[PDB]
């Protein structure tokens, strides 16, 4: 059961929260201070921007630290306009009880560099309420992340 | 809370509506009259088809004009079979209150051209009810689009 | 309306079920015995693994046979860590009433091979309840699939 815009203000910790980011049933997460492009970490705050080269993917830290209640799933989709620019998001579930800045994979499938300003809206997260609190809210190894978090699989 | 097939007929404006497109909990949007492949706009109605070249993406206008109620989110996924053909969709949220034909990004990640007939089913949109109407239903710059709509970000 | 972890045990047929796969609001489907990489079928059980070459996609059979009730939609997302590794999932809806092992497209958008063990968690499926049973629960040509199922579109 999806949180409308007005329930998102009341019911999702979004820091820092941006009014222009609030969408009818979701929130435009913004480009944060960290990215990972071509094997290199980017200070997107310093550089002012992340540039996703043609046919490369970036890992982009959300500016927003997102804290989910134990009964809410974060469902993320690329901003339409980045899709229209050839960018594919590869997003995971934002598990109930998640707390942290999100590390987001965007793949520039186009032949043109795709540039995002620091603090630019790029992923709309929507919020699905669970039928009741998750028995085991998120306690995975990315919890509390405030930095670009790479794969811990290996 | 997801609309089953029977609630989709009653509760989503789908024009033109196709019975073969109605799925158990979603609707197979079909390939419309416009596409954008390799920097060029395609009259998919005229050509009869869009061909997504190996390792390229296309912007495909939906044949269907979709109008969402203010309490329903459009949640889009590639048809399974296009996924099985190497095609990746990059879809945005279809925001509550959306009205228009959808511009959809499909990336042919395969090495074989992926061809879609005009009017062929290619994206199943599912419909999530919001907990209550969005306070600010969709009023973004793509509203009412009846044509391939490119990125307005810049 | 999303099934929390505890409702997934009670309300989704998952065979074989793995406790480490159960997530706060979803289940980590695991890499099954079949894959399709570079035009070739892989016995992932025999090989012990599937290797997705740089910039290629694989079709991966889920280890789990998943049976959905007629009022539940399967909503699939890549494991976060595979996203962080440059992998893009292209998933369809898991339609209500689905019964079978899922054929999943993962695209390695990275320049490094992405390897998955047989039985390794790779896609978290979440379960959205429909507002009521689908009138026509899934009866498509992939129903009952227990093998990698390719595109039947043509």
Swiss-Prot record, chains A, B, C:
The metabolic or biological pathway listed in the UniProt record of this protein is: Pyrimidine metabolism; dUMP biosynthesis; dUMP from dCTP (dUTP route): step 1/2
Quick check: keyword Protein biosynthesis in the entry? no
Extract one GO BP annotation from the record: dUTP biosynthetic process
Single GO molecular function: nucleotide binding
Family matches, as InterPro entries = dCTP_deaminase (IPR011962), dUTPase-like_sf (IPR036157), dUTPase_trimeric (IPR033704)
Protein keywords: Hydrolase, Nucleotide metabolism, Nucleotide-binding
Q: Coiled-coil ranges per the record?
A: none
Q: Could you tell me the EC number(s) of this protein?
A: 3.5.4.13
**In which residues is dCTP bound?**
79-84, 95, 124, 138
What is catalysed by this protein?
A: dCTP + H2O + H(+) = dUTP + NH4(+)
Q: Name one Pfam family in it.
A: DCD
Q: Which superkingdom, per the lineage?
A: Archaea
Subunit arrangement?
Answer: Homotrimer.
Q: Which family does it belong to?
A: Belongs to the dCTP deaminase family.
Its annotated function is as follows:
Catalyzes the deamination of dCTP to dUTP.
Protein name (record):
dCTP deaminase
Task: Please report the organism this UniProt entry assigns to the protein.
Answer: Pyrococcus furiosus (strain ATCC 43587 / DSM 3638 / JCM 8422 / Vc1)
